[PDB]
Amino acid sequence: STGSATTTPIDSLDDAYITPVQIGTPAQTLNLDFDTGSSDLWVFSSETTASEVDGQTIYTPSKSTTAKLLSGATWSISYGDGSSSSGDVYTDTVSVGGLTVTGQAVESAKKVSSSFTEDSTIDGLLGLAFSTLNTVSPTQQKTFFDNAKASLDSPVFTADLGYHAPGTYNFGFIDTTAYTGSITYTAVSTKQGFWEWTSTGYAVGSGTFKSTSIDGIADTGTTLLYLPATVVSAYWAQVSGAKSSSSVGGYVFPCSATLPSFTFGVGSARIVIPGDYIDFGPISTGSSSCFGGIQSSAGIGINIFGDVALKAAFVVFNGATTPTLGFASK
Hints:
Oligomer: monomer
CATH architecture of the largest domain: Beta Barrel
Number of domains: 2
CATH class of the largest domain: Mainly Beta
Radius of gyration: 20 Å
GO molecular function: aspartic-type endopeptidase activity
Shape: globular
Number of helices: 4
CATH superfamily of the largest domain: Acid Proteases
Distance between the termini: 25 Å
Family: Belongs to the peptidase A1 family.
Protein name: Endothiapepsin
Helix content: under 10%
Number of strands: 24
Keywords: Aspartyl protease, Disulfide bond, Hydrolase, Protease, Signal, Zymogen
Order of helices and strands: EEEEEEEHEHEEEEEEHEEEEEEEEHEE
Domain Peptidase A1: 17-328
């Protein structure tokens, strides 16, 4: 089997992307944030504290003939950005782009933090990291991909995120028309539960590529590119007027600037992020100062190849017995 679904930016900055997901019988369609950096499929629901719901579409398990309550099970997650959510657990039929998993754990939120409430466009998350990170207790549950894997034509999914435009998540096949050149594959460590890999280096604009190992995670659920302070300083030093602002929370630059590209290595291959992808707009409405899309990972504890990096590539998440990642230009 296969599936194919369009993913759409939530706003004009590509802050996140939402993908329609069918849950239950009859289908209830919710728009979920596909997150390769976490492993819980959780939704706003009829159980979510009413005051914490503000415009989201909710899952109502009592209206689904296929919903089952997982007796006594609970879940609770905290994300790197400080957001959180928690609740109880159902299993139900879940379909993405024509691909159906029966008995998928659908984690129903009783509580969500303010950042989720405040974002009316995101009805929940669909985790695509390794199931070892799933937070269900007492017994951890499997991700949508882990459940679908054995049925897929090939044990893979691909992320093809757009810049200021829709893109595509495919399950079970590689669309050979969706990228230019060849896909370069690279090793993955699953030891921390992430799609963790080692980039072979970077370049800033037209500068000569520096060969150096950069360990990080491929994370569709993180907006920006977070890299070591050395690398990030080298990038912003090439932007007139750029500086790190502790009050703003990162590197800012004059909105009138022409940003250089940023290149990262995948083996001997190279992915070039155009300068425009690194512009995240005025720091506040009407400001001439803009927020940068490449920021330091110091204090995160891990480097994160988030949407800024991933949307410059066609990315293969290969869930074979020994997982790998593939990257192609597009």
